[model samples]
Target: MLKKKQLTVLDLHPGAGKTRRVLPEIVREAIKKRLRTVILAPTRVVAAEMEEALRGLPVRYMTTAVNVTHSGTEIVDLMCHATFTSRLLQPIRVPNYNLNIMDEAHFTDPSSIAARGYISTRVEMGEAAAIFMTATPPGTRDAFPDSNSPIMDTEVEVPERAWSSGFDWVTDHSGKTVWFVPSVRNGNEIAACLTKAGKRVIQLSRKTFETEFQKTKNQEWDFVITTDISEMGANFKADRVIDSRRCLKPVILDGERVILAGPMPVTHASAAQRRGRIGRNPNKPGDEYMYGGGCAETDEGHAHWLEARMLLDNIYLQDGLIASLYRPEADKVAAIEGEFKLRTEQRKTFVELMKRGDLPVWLAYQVASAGITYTDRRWCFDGTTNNTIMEDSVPAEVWTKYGEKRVLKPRWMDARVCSDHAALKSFKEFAAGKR
Candidate 1:
């Protein structure tokens, strides 16, 4: 596991120029190898940045293979449109060897459905060499079920022009709640009333709450209420953030405090996105509290505050590389060993071609941390359906790879999974021998 990076919303100060300078070399290497580099990241914004940084390379232009997943779901078809398509589905239209560069490399943890889907793709496209890149790499392995496969070339530990994106939630958090207290109301009049009551009201938007952002930095507001805007970038001063926009689609951010009505909200993502606003930065003090129909009560129609817990359980519960070190399970330990075996093979493959005699350290990291995770083969059936078919799992709904939840979560959990620092790092120190 790597050391926890100290980062914040304001500290995104690490100029992209540095990243631009370094990304070219990586992209060039991939093209030289005739490989398709897969670059997947936590945010589409950053991923887009990496892709743009590589456009200047002569090969990028010459290959005419330069296209983005979001821009065009079809690689070979070349139909450009906004799409959330994953690289796995992207057509490899290139004539020569291709490069697959997966960015925000930490997402490789096997437990993630997104990561699992990507892995399934890699296994399917084993022919193309991969150049997975990430600033914050988790502890895992590069190889898979077999040792003879091409694991990462570990000869190079840390390479030149090393890159790191100090991602920590603490940077955005302010210690005092005196500036921001989250407030939620039933309707517009209620929202206005709260605003008039000295609360910085926020509807549902992805951008940082400027009203509270400016005031919190200046120690101004006592409370802040934003639908979901607070989670996109940040909520600077307001320690308390509210999510009360009921536009059929609920906002569900990954926090412990959420207002739930029943077993499941009409919309899930909305709820997840809302809860995500709270409990992000590790440095931020106090546990986020949920208050609503299902906030504090749960058994009957007012099924307690299970939404927050359900969201946190499935979304923010996965451990990153930092926590798997000392306490790694047997499967993970084996994956590391398997990846090491491929080093020799990788070096030979590249050497016969007479390129850099080895793979990059980031590749080595991918090798070391591979195959050490709980793979989810399927998704949970919707629990809100009264007629939902009940199934029995090992431990029978009591224990699991993560844990159990009694209800469905707000939809926002997916967004906050990586971005929520407090939720993400709770298990870091517990990894290896530290905790």
Candidate 2:
């Protein structure tokens, strides 16, 4: 039945082993029938881990050869969307996969370019089924209107009594620990503290934790510290879990490890996801702790906690709660859409006008942004002439009309954007050679 369907949303608990236990069987079946399968994960660690897990199976799990027909399954990080889904990169394409699985589906913001890029790819491929698996399912009725086709809904709830104080548990039991800190500095501080106390510590980051993880993941460490890196699928046997307090802004640490408040408040869903990492060891009773050292009610941290609690309770659609929480995101999406439209129009204007003459860079861009059209640059910018040029790619003849040498020079040499974007520096240098 799943094989025949187009989309399914699996709302399962964190430790339910959906990816490890369930997905393999699905992939196995697809491979048995010689159908292609692809799984997308939110983080690089998860994608790499999934690839490692799938290696034991008969299906192929890793590949860089693009557009080549897959005989089995392929696991990709979010970055793979540019190559496969967006198909923006030329000469490399993904074979139409039969099954598409999104491991941490909640990360897909409906209004984000990342979401559109990957989603568009899925739309183009025309897969038979796409499975969205996440603990915090899109709670609203109209969140994802496009692929809301339901197959099965599985919800897992741990008893309130099952959650315990992580710090308190650490004092008693000494098996293994995973401390989820809010910021990297906070994580480093805690790890340093633990290390001074003679505890073996390992630090993991989505950016820096790969090679070390590859070498030491199999060997056990006493403690592991992480931020978004530890949210999911870092399999560890632990007796306790410690999480840094929720704050609006990400804490910054200078030469010293310090907490800097970030603007994005941490929600209950995020806390739950972190705590879910610990107590995952089925054999032992475990504990989880919330580290609210620098956290306080005055700093809007209190409000975030309340928001998370409300979201967990499914208390959505309250007096403008949805609008308050999501309006900024919606606005950002609109801006992106508008920008995409402008760039697309600019491109169309360039293609049409460049054939006529060496068009002035500014004039070409303005004209392109003004003309209306449908579906330019993989985005449907239809009839919306109000667009802007993202990268002003004008022709060689009219390119100098935009003053390539003078305008593209460094600030010391009178270049404004040159100091802003490093890429512009290379272009300016290239233009100098051409002159």
Candidate 3:
């Protein structure tokens, strides 16, 4: 009943319950109180799931379709008991809503337009409240379910069986499997292997995560191979979980120099979250297979083979900071510590640049908004004529290069400009309200 008060509750709970179960009940309560509810999700897929998850709950809900304006009197009437994506919520006013729930709230960096908007809008609503829910709650002082608890921390083991070099699906225990790899590069490799082995696989990378997540929700795959983005809220039960961080790491060079590449390392917290994906069936616990599966022999240098075995087999065998008490062999410890120092120094320089605001935010914004891909090595930003102005541009050359066989996104003059402007104003206004 805490949601009844005008409180911004942060629900740092994990997995399916936070969205599929918790949100539906909140909407049900809002309806009973004769109050309007608005749920905001970060993407179309999440918004669609929140919409679908609330069905049969005695509440009427509607989703704002892609690219729709959300500020009409009709929108207020609709969100009177509805949900929409944050993108849609940007132009929308919500003076009459009693509840607003932000799903995948980790993305709501205080510097983001969404965070500023949510802060000021909730203040404007006076007695209304909002809820921010996610498994990985960033920048908050929330503790994860104990790292030592059996139920929450589940057992971790290397894949008992082998396929060429790493895991063998045919040898592992049954039920749906969810595999976590470090990057899209590794995900594609695993996806190809599983597909060739005749396993129904849904590969979720930055490009196709939504489509694959939809399929995952429908239980249409034998395996869901994904990147770190899916590590938080999307839900699916698995009889086995395969987690590997065996990918190239961006080695950080110090003092404004480019970050070099190094061996990718796995942290205990990351390993634990992946392991927790198993055993969701409740009655019986699921099995786990952890290994450095993708780091090919050709990728090796600096005694890579021995270090990989030590990480996947020894150092990663347990969780918690104290695991270091049972440290690896002497040389292994020396090598690991050297890499740790390198990353530590690299991150310090990055933080220094960030604090001073030395990075090129404007150019980055232009590159992103123009939808320029590496497919075209170079393109002019007609969006900005002299680095201070905003203008319309022709559609990106990548689109023109491959003849349009499919529907295309409409071009915009300046994509993130208006939103950034509003965000700065929101922060200013929000600060003023406190005084």
Candidate 4:
């Protein structure tokens, strides 16, 4: 079980669970408990692997799950990992049940619009699984406080390799090139280049989404190109899904609704879902190529690079959590992480409630207790300001090492993040102490 006194850990990659000697048992139980079970993975390849692991199980359907990326909407009927899975700020489409198995529970992160969405999705799904499974918990302190547990009270295991055997790497040698197409502007050029080379360059956009999708429903394309749409619900086996084919004249938009693109970055949580396109099968090199839009006039490239870097660094590993069942203290870590999910959501809701003002005061107080509260200057004057700082609310010491006054000013954040979106500009002046 995941909540035993002793902790355990596995030392292998997700696909190599067979060598680690625990994946088969985990899969057997997970399938046995197929109570609308869901698997959380950080990349498309892992989603593919988890799907493959679950194939031929009691369940009868196979939608690859990768289609759920950036979907934010859960449609269990409409198959695909990207869609069925949950995302930040969006209601989880996966139906609640008794067994929710997170293959890479470790990757359920709280960063970016896509990653942070897990709070709602997982909490909603986690309820069904009175029992669960995991492989790896966060191995580092900054990654996850509880390094040896599931994200719940369910049973878990972390299988260790005979010598850290679960391994795969992407390389240029595979001849399987992932075309890193540029934004909406350059996607056409890339598509043309590929097309001219006799490679099938499939294009997608708001314009062609409805009519041409059926026309070009090729099982596989050497190049799958889209104009900022096609991120979610695309095939899991896609060799490559290029984002932002802007030059293609927006093939996926009608009014305000935009279509899915593999890399449009609908949310922090969904970004990882996009990464699931590759690495679906075992023993193959899974590669993810990236490109960005930049010009001479701005610091755009760095911003894009930061987004990619944070995506890689901050995103947790999901299948790794499945291996964590062998951890000596899976229960403790799971409990702590689950509590962290609840408390963190509470803190987030608390702040949002203050700004939203429609939520019940009692619920707001509940979140307020978690780690958020109103900071009132009791006696407001030019010279003196005193206030009550809750034990866990404010972190006055050693927050971030840099980016205080010059960049990412805290005062600016206090008003910017704390205040309602409608009244944002008023605090802009206050952020700099100008008013």
lDDT of 3 at 400: 33
Tens digit per residue, CA lDDT, model 2, 1-435: 245445677766776777777777766776676655666655556766665556556544343422234554343222332223223212245455566666775542221223323333344345356666767543322211211122111122211111234434343546666666555545666677667667788877644566556534577788777665566555666655655534333121231111234523345445556656655545544244434333222223222222122221221122322212222122222122222223333454543432332222222333455563312221211112222112345311113323432332111111111212333433333334422
Weakest 10 consecutive residues, lDDT, candidate 1? 1-10
lDDT of each: 0.29, 0.43, 0.42, 0.32
Candidate 2: misplaced stretches above 4 Å?
1-5, 32-34, 51-58, 63-91, 108-117, 120-128, 140-173, 214-220, 247-264, 291-338, 341-435
Off by over 4 Å in 3: 1-16, 32-34, 56-98, 107-113, 120-128, 139-163, 166-173, 196-198, 214-221, 245-273, 289-364, 367-435
Question: Model 1, range 203-306, lDDT digits (tens) per residue?
Answer: 32223333334554555544443433232223343344333323211122232112322223212323333443444444554434332222211111211112
For residues 1-435, could you state the per-residue lDDT of candidate 3 as single tens digits?
535445454544354467777877777667777666666665556655665676545433344433344343222122211133222222344354566666665442112222323333444445556666655443333223432122432334433222465444333545677777666655666677777777788887644666667778676678888765565445566666666644333321221112214336443334434555654554664244444432232222322222222222211111321112111112322334222211223333322222232222222222333444312212322223332222224322212333322111222222222123332233222212211
TM-score (C-alpha) between model 1 and the true structure:
0.30
Model 1 residue runs over 4 Å out of place are 1-21, 41-43, 58-97, 107-126, 135-435
Candidate 4 ranges beyond 4 A from true positions: 1-24, 30-52, 60-98, 103-174, 182-185, 203-435
Tens-place lDDT per residue, model 4, 1-435, is: 322221223423223342123544554565454434444443343445555554443433334433333333322221322333222122333354333333343332222212222322334334333222232333321211121112111111211111123212211222333333324335566566556546665655533544434434544556555533343233334443222211111111221111223222232222223333454454444344332221121111212222222222212334322111213222222122222222444544543443443222222333355354333211111111221111234422211222233222231012112222223333223223332
* TM-score of candidate 3 relative to the true fold: 0.51
RMSD to the true structure for each prediction, in A, is 20.7, 14.5, 16.3, 17.9
Model 3, residue 407: what's the lDDT? 18
The positional error of residue 273 in candidate 2, measured at the CA in angstroms, is 1.7
lDDT for model 4 comes to 0.32
Cα distance off (Å), candidate 4, residue 248:
17
